[PDB]
Amino acid sequence: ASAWPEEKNYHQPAILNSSALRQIAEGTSISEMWQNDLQPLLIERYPGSPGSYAARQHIMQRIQRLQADWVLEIDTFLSQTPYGYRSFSNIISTLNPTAKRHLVLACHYDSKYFSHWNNRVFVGATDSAVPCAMMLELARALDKKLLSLKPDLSLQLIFFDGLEAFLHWSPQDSLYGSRHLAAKMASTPHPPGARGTSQLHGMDLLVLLDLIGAPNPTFPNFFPNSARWFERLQAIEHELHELGLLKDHSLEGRYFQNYSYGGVIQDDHIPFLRRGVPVLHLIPSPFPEVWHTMDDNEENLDESTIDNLNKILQVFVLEYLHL
């Protein structure tokens, strides 16, 4: 029995030099992302709604136009909810489907259901339209480098449906898409034809982006088994800063701070985490002040912060994949 599922434990990044770091910083466009990937998502899109369908089409369209050989799959399922049985659709975008290992980036694309109030509509800009757009921008910015993937390791993007509770958060009313996908992936042999390893053994690391877009986020180092990757984010943020490649940024106000978090934050990584998948949870603590209010909109997004995080994440991925 091959020990390939243990490779993630020893995987090391291929660190980019200064010139490559400048190249990545210049290759991403916050204004392009804003207009082409983010604004079309700033709409009401709770599960089963017309907005959900439109968001899903937008995400797929933006990935399909890229040169890299992305394979798109829509994982549609039924679940009981406080409003009865409903349909949900997770979006999975994968390079090299039969590749044994994948670094996974994820976020949820649904928005919490709220009835309109005083003509205001909830669109969850940081929760999680921005993370969705950051993943789309990453696919676009690194497209040429990702095309060269067409170490049996590649990249996968997951956009979960139904992260939000239809009412208030509870064990049975929340995490619909991830509870479903995690169970499905855990019972799917991988690579095809495998005897005893699942798609979950193939997940090197799950990088879950959530609640990003507000000013001054501080991401804690939640888990000891991914702490060495959290440190890479810190190193990348530090070098991009020292090279003058970040905007309105200081080390005192750095995003990746040295600090554990006792508790546990319920989010889409939970069903994966509890089945042994290593997770790097990029959710800030505390949550954005506009969390779950009509003010979680475009107007309250911090543009240079998102731009800085796009550069950091893009360098993290290139270094992880050795690209």
Ligand SMILES: [Zn+2]
């Ligand atoms: Zn939320």
